[PDB]
Amino acid sequence: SKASQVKVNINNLKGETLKSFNYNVGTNATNTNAVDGTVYNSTATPEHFAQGFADTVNNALAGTGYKVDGDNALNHVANLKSGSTLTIYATE
Structure with missing residues (x-):
């Protein structure tokens, strides 16, 4: 749901998506800041x-x-909003 979730892509540092999942950011409308404590300690x-x-x-x-x-900090996006796609980065 664009209103309640963000899409998360876990990528490596070579432009390649390892895994993906949706995450509830506590909202009831799209383009709205994630509620504190969903993805980050502080949105x-x-x-x-x-x-x-x-x-x-x-x-x-x-x-x-x-x-x-x-x-x-490379995995920190400030003011992440519902309906967005978040990219975080993994290493071996």
Whole structure:
């Protein structure tokens, strides 16, 4: 749903999508800031993955040999909004 979710693509650093999933950002209308604690600790000033989001990322990457560091600023998009596609980056 564009109104309640974002699309997440976990890519490597070579332009290649490893896994994808949808994530609930707590909204009821599209183009609206994610609720704090869904994807990031703070939607306006992201600094860490929310634990539920980190668990979903880690579960999605099981078996791939890759890992995403939610503390890395390269994986932080401020003011992420419902209906958007988020790209985060994994390394081996």
